[PDB]
Amino acid sequence: MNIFEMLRIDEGLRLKIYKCTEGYYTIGIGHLLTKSPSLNAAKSELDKAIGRNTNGVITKDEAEKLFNQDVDAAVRGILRNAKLKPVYDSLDAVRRAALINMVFQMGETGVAGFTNSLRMLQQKRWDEAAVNLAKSRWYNQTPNRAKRVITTFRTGTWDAYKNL
Hints:
By secondary structure, the chain is mainly α. The protein has one domain (1-164): Orthogonal Bundle (Lysozyme). The protein is built from nine helices and three strands. The chain has helices at residues 3-11, 39-50, 60-80, 85-90, 93-112, 115-122, 126-134, 137-141, 143-155, and strands at residues 14-19, 25-28, 31-34. The chain has a three-stranded antiparallel beta sheet. A hairpin with a 2-residue loop joins β2 and β3 (31-34). The termini are close together. 30% of the residues are buried. It is an enzyme of class 3 (hydrolase). This is Endolysin. Its EC number is 3.2.1.17. Substrate binds at residues 32, 104, 117, 132. Belongs to the glycosyl hydrolase 24 family.
């Protein structure tokens, strides 16, 4: 298992424009197009991202290219963040993948806001962090995914993902 497979499990793969769990237009492997209510606004951002007149449908290859760009971006956002970086750097390989997952889902900003959980993961207090992570809207809104991620930080293994 690795980050790509991990997020591909969590996000799924859709070739047409769709609405994510928050009602925003997305496509591909969880690639957010716009928070805007306009389907046209979405179609515009999509063509612009893809570089052609897509008409709201893309190919597998195009989805995987946006996915590679997205993952890359997430890592670089973590690296550039004064709050995230030190946490990232203190983690082992499995747990780093759980941090990228959250950054991919909610932005570096959203994540940098879990101050206490960050501190805890940094101190390697697994169980405490896991409890603090669950007290959040994130967990209440997407409990199945949040649980897999939280298990990942708690255990340091991919158990939550084997079976899926």
